[PDB]
Amino acid sequence: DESCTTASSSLAKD
Amino acid sequence: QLQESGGGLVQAGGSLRLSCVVSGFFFDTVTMAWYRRAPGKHRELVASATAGGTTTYADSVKDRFTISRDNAKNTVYLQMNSLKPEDTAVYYCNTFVRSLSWGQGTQVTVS
Amino acid sequence: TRVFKKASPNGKLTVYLGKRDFVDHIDLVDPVDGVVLVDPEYLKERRVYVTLTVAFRYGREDLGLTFRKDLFVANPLTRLQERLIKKLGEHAYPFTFEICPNLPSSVTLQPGPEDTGKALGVDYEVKAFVAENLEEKIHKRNSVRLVIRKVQYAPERPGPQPTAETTRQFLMSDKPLHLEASLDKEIYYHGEPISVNVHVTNNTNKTVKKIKISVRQYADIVLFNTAQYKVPVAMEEADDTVAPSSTFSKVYTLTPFLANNREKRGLALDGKLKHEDTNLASSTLLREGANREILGIIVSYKVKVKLVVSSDVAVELPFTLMHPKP
Amino acid sequence: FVALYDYESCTETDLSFKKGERLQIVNNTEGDWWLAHSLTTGQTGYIPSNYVAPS
Amino acid sequence: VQLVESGGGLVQPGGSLRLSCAASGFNVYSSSIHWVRQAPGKGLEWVASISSYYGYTYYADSVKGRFTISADTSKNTAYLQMNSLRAEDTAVYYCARSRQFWYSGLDYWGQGTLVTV
Amino acid sequence: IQMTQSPSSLSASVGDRVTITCRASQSVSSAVAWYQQKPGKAPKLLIYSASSLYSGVPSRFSGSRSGTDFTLTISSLQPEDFATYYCQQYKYVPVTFGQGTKVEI
């Protein structure tokens, strides 16, 4: 099995 | 794939049993967790369940929720009891490390 | 606000990063901060490591040549790191790399039709894995590999206008032949045209046939005994004859771009995250009296002017080709 | 023992050496980075083992 | 600083037409020139674009086999030949541009050229 | 990629607050722009990135992102803001515009 795909995710304001 | 079930409408005192089956992935040893997102808010963690049975709950759902994990049928169940209006959100499932794609969760609304 | 994440094939590891491009100010380099999320039942009898490496590649198969640094961290918190700790949970372990201000910038050499595998050049890779100890082998299935970059941007204060003049005195000619040239400015952006202002006054008894103007790129690789490679990127040739005892003056315009230089082997392009299309390599900004570190390719640009006297007269006009700061 | 290529350190714990420097490899010799001190200048620091030539 | 264009007019139901978009101020290699069409009474739709720095051309599925976009860097002009138009190509054509490097959103727009098929 | 835009028409007085939502079919990251087109003229850029204001646009226009739900908000409708607004995504090569939202008075 190869690598996974580079994703993104949210982040709180503070 | 990742699709959930069990959503619906309940009063303040009802109970639901959320569940989801994952295809294309195996969690014979991965730690699977349930996530919830209140409307207009960022996603949080609700419950967790390792393969060995060591389960951890968020403080706001302690003594009420109970996460079941069926390794044979490749399914994770969340059972919710004694609901309150604060528990209105949309619930997702994922690994503890948030590795899988999020998908579209199931909606729970409490009057 | 968003963060970049990559997951392990086995679904028990994740690496969170604030950004992928880390600017290189001459005084200091932006730190590489982040955090690693790990399965509760994965650290039962193991420890989690984080490795960042910088490598210079000049081989196809390890005949293959690679020389690299390994910076090793085994897990004051910044604002982003404490936000990530607040969001992910308790099982997130932060890491921070402060790479030195002097280090090769991300530059990848253009691959030819025959080359396969990873492209030659310099690149940075962030790796994180869980192992019982160091000697245990770690497969590609149990680790997260992510590629970051190091970049520089155009200086705020432009330098003096480039200029260079020369005189050639022929054998049977008493008076000399005078050439002058000057660019419009020093710092040019990517795609911005270059306007060389050539002014030649011939007092000799020999005519001049053709004027050749070319923009050249000097890829200086310091590992190969400071061997220097120069390949033209733009060429403008005109039949601008100047008769003896006469004066000439014209302004030429050039613009280096990639759609014409795809067939050239060994070109220098800006760093790539993967197999991708990237522009020509921006000039490297070096500190005063900077030591020649072994890892890295130093690229600089120069405009040449040439007269083909019916024996050749030429000058070189250095300039800077960099991206504007956003 | 003898150094290949050149190294410049941005950290005080790492020693910077030039080509041909006579580095003495002191008992700390495990890992990817060795700890050593130069025989021609006399400061102790960690060096990358990636370029140190024996003999 | 501004874009201008001409070439629109009345076309036979299956004839051919060509629109030229002259660019002033922008450098062709430093920007990417797009073509966007707006049918009468409907929304916007993207038909073709050019990336003369890299030499690439992109089209839409509706006009893949007919339209041909090209640019003349000497005159800083981009053309759009329409080889075989059908009755649903009647629209207003806006010539747009965008930063070549690290942007793809159209910020300078020309006037409209009505094309009636 | 489908880019469904709601509502298709509003009706707001001068000095009120309006909000226009545009939801992408799939993940498009923060590559969404907004345009304004008064009838008879060419569209004008408003917000190039997800929430980055374009030069020359007044301060009342603003943008936001929450997952795949991009929103453009006007904090005060001066009588020169009654026009049609489109949402565009530019991550993938088949660039698609929004359906179109009109503002009445």
- Is the separation of the CB atoms in E62 and E2 below 8 Å? no
Q: What are phi and psi of E56, to 5 degrees?
A: -100, 150
Amino acid at residue number F102: K
Question: Can you tell me the distance from the alpha carbon of B66 to that of B47, in angstroms, rounded to the nearest whole number?
Answer: 8
CA distances from F10 to C206, F6, F18, F102 (A): 79, 10, 8, 6
DSSP strand pairing (C2-7 vs C107-109) = unpaired
Query: Which of C215, C223, C189 has its CA nearest to residue C295?
Result: C223
| CATH at C64 | 2.60.40.840
Q: Which residue has the tokens 């100890």?
A: C133
Question: In terms of residue numbers, what domain contains C26?
Answer: 4-151
Q: Which two tokens stand for residue B18?
A: 């959320």
Question: Can you tell me the distance from the alpha carbon of E113 to that of E10, in angstroms, rounded to the nearest whole number?
Answer: 11
For F50-74, letters b (16+ CB in 10 Å) and e give beebbeebeeebbbebeeeebbbeb
- Is the separation of the CB atoms in E113 and E19 below 8 Å? yes
- Is the separation of the CB atoms in D18 and D3 below 8 Å? yes
Question: Can you tell me the distance from the alpha carbon of B85 to that of B100, in angstroms, rounded to the nearest whole number?
Answer: 29
Q: Name the residue in chain B with its Cα closest to that of C10.
A: B30
Asked if the Cβ–Cβ distance from D10 to C100 is below 8 Å, we say yes
From chain F residues 15-34, the ones with a CB under 8 A of any chain E CB are 31, 33
| CATH at F34 | 2.60.40.10
Question: Can you tell me the distance from the alpha carbon of C121 to that of C70, in angstroms, rounded to the nearest whole number?
Answer: 17
- Is the separation of the CB atoms in E89 and E35 below 8 Å? no
Domain count, chain C: 2
Beta partners for F53? F47
Give me the helices (H) in chain C, please.
79-88
Asked if the Cβ–Cβ distance from B97 to C87 is below 8 Å, we say no
Domain count, chain D: 1
Cβ-nearest to A12 among B42, B98, B101? B42
Question: Can you tell me the distance from the alpha carbon of B89 to that of F91, in angstroms, rounded to the nearest whole number?
Answer: 30
Is residue C208 domain-shared with residue C139, that is, in the same domain?
no
- Is the separation of the CB atoms in E104 and E111 below 8 Å? no
Q: In what order do the strands lie in the sheet with C312-321?
A: C187-188, C312-321, C297-309, C208-221, C227-238
Q: Name the residue in chain C with its Cα closest to that of E28.
A: C191
Chains interfacing with D (3 or more CB pairs < 8 Å): C
Burial of E10 (0-12, 13-18, 19+ CB in 10 A): exposed
Query: Which of C100, C87, C102 has its CA nearest to residue C32?
Result: C100
Asked if the Cβ–Cβ distance from E109 to F94 is below 8 Å, we say no
Residues of A in contact with C6 (CB under 8 A): 4, 6-7
Burial of B84 (0-12, 13-18, 19+ CB in 10 A): exposed
Question: Can you tell me the distance from the alpha carbon of C31 to that of F68, in angstroms, rounded to the nearest whole number?
Answer: 30
C81 to chain B, closest Cα gap in Å: 17
Question: Can you tell me the distance from the alpha carbon of B70 to that of B68, in angstroms, rounded to the nearest whole number?
Answer: 7
- Is the separation of the CB atoms in B60 and B12 below 8 Å? no
Whether residue C40 is preceded by a cis peptide bond, meaning omega within 30 degrees of 0, is no
Question: Can you tell me the distance from the alpha carbon of F56 to that of C279, in angstroms, rounded to the nearest whole number?
Answer: 30
From chain B residues 38-57, the ones with a CB under 8 A of any chain A CB are 42-43
Asked if the Cβ–Cβ distance from B50 to C40 is below 8 Å, we say yes
Structural domain contains residue C224: yes
Query: Are there at least 3 beta-carbon pairs closer than 8 Å between C and E?
Result: yes
C70 to chain D, closest Cα gap in Å: 7
- Is the separation of the CB atoms in C95 and C35 below 8 Å? yes
- Is the separation of the CB atoms in C7 and A13 below 8 Å? no
- Experimental method, per PDB record: cryo-EM
Cβ-nearest to E103 among F44, F48, F99? F48
Helices (H) and strands (E) in chain F, counts: 0, 10
Question: Can you tell me the distance from the alpha carbon of E95 to that of E76, in angstroms, rounded to the nearest whole number?
Answer: 13
Does C230 appear as a known binding residue?
yes
Listed residues C151, C183, C212: the one ending a domain? C151
Query: Which residues from E are below 8 Å from F when comparing CB atoms?
Result: 43-46, 58, 60-61, 94, 103-107, 109-112
Question: Can you tell me the distance from the alpha carbon of B36 to that of B105, in angstroms, rounded to the nearest whole number?
Answer: 9
Asked if the Cβ–Cβ distance from C3 to A3 is below 8 Å, we say no
Residues of C in contact with B45 (CB under 8 A): 89
Can you point out the beta strands (E) in chain D? 2-3, 23-25, 33-38, 44-48, 52-53
CA distances from C171 to C176, C206, C231, C244, C311 (A): 10, 10, 33, 15, 10
| CATH at D25 | 2.30.30.40
Cβ-nearest to C4 among A2, A6, A14? A6
Query: Which of C122, C94, C90 has its CA nearest to residue C109?
Result: C122
Cα of first residue to Cα of last residue in chain D, in angstroms, is 6
Q: Name the residue in chain B with its Cα closest to that of A7.
A: B101
- Angle ∠(C223,C225,C231) on CA atoms, nearest 5: 80
CA atoms within 13 A on the CB side of F68: 15
DSSP strand pairing (C194-202 vs C187-188) = unpaired
Does C304 appear as a known binding residue?
yes
For B42-57, letters b (16+ CB in 10 Å) and e give ebebbbbbbeeeebeb
- Is the separation of the CB atoms in C168 and C177 below 8 Å? yes
Q: What is the DSSP string of F39-70?
A: TTS--EEEESSSSPBPTT--SSEEEEESSSEE
Q: Name the residue in chain A with its Cα closest to that of C142.
A: A3
Does C137 appear as a known binding residue?
no
Residues of C in contact with A4 (CB under 8 A): 6-9
Question: In terms of residue numbers, what domain contains E14?
Answer: 2-115
Amino acid at residue number C276: E
From chain C residues 87-106, the ones with a CB under 8 A of any chain B CB are 87, 89, 91
Cβ-nearest to E105 among F33, F96, F99? F33
Amino acid at residue number B67: I
Is residue C217 domain-shared with residue C117, that is, in the same domain?
no
DSSP strand pairing (F18-24 vs F3-6) = antiparallel
CA distances from C24 to C81, C98, C154, C285 (A): 21, 11, 11, 9
Does C235 appear as a known binding residue?
yes
| CATH at E70 | 2.60.40.10
Residues before each break in chain B (C–N > 2.5 Å)?
none
Amino acid at residue number C134: L
Find all residues with CB under 8 Å of E77, minimum gap 6, and list them.
E20, E21, E22, E23, E71
Interface test with C, best of B97, B98, B101, B102 (most C CBs within 10 A): B97
Residues of E in contact with C192 (CB under 8 A): 27, 30
Domain count, chain F: 1
Residues of A in contact with C7 (CB under 8 A): 4, 7
Q: What are phi and psi of C84, to 5 degrees?
A: -65, -40
- Is the separation of the CB atoms in C200 and C207 below 8 Å? no
Q: Name the residue in chain C with its Cα closest to that of D9.
A: C100
Query: Which of C257, C199, C203, C206 has its CA nearest to residue C232?
Result: C257
- Is the separation of the CB atoms in E49 and E34 below 8 Å? yes
- Is the separation of the CB atoms in C122 and C105 below 8 Å? yes
Q: Which two tokens stand for residue C192?
A: 């911005």
Cβ-nearest to F45 among E44, E46, E105? E105
How many CB atoms within 10 Å of residue F39?
Answer: 8
Q: Which two tokens stand for residue C167?
A: 């005189």
Is residue C228 domain-shared with residue C117, that is, in the same domain?
no
Q: Which two tokens stand for residue C196?
A: 């060389």
Query: Which residues from A are below 8 Å from C when comparing CB atoms?
Result: 1-4, 6-14
Give me the total of CB pairs closer than 8 Å, taking one residue from chain E and one from chain F: 43
Q: Which residue has the tokens 């101020």?
A: E25
Asked if the Cβ–Cβ distance from A8 to C3 is below 8 Å, we say yes
SS3 B11: coil
DSSP H or E segment with residue E78: strand E77-82
Residues of E in contact with F93 (CB under 8 A): 58
Question: Can you tell me the distance from the alpha carbon of C189 to that of C265, in angstroms, rounded to the nearest whole number?
Answer: 24
Is residue C181 domain-shared with residue C316, that is, in the same domain?
yes
- Is the separation of the CB atoms in C230 and C216 below 8 Å? yes
Q: Which two tokens stand for residue E107?
A: 């910020």
Q: What are phi and psi of D9, to 5 degrees?
A: -105, 135
Question: Can you tell me the distance from the alpha carbon of C273 to that of C124, in angstroms, rounded to the nearest whole number?
Answer: 9
Residues of A in contact with B101 (CB under 8 A): 7
Question: Can you tell me the distance from the alpha carbon of D43 to that of C283, in angstroms, rounded to the nearest whole number?
Answer: 35
Burial of C160 (0-12, 13-18, 19+ CB in 10 A): exposed
Q: How much of chain A is in helix, strand and coil states, percent to nearest 5?
A: 0, 30, 70
Residues of A in contact with B99 (CB under 8 A): 4
Q: Which two tokens stand for residue C247?
A: 């004066």
Residues of E in contact with F89 (CB under 8 A): none
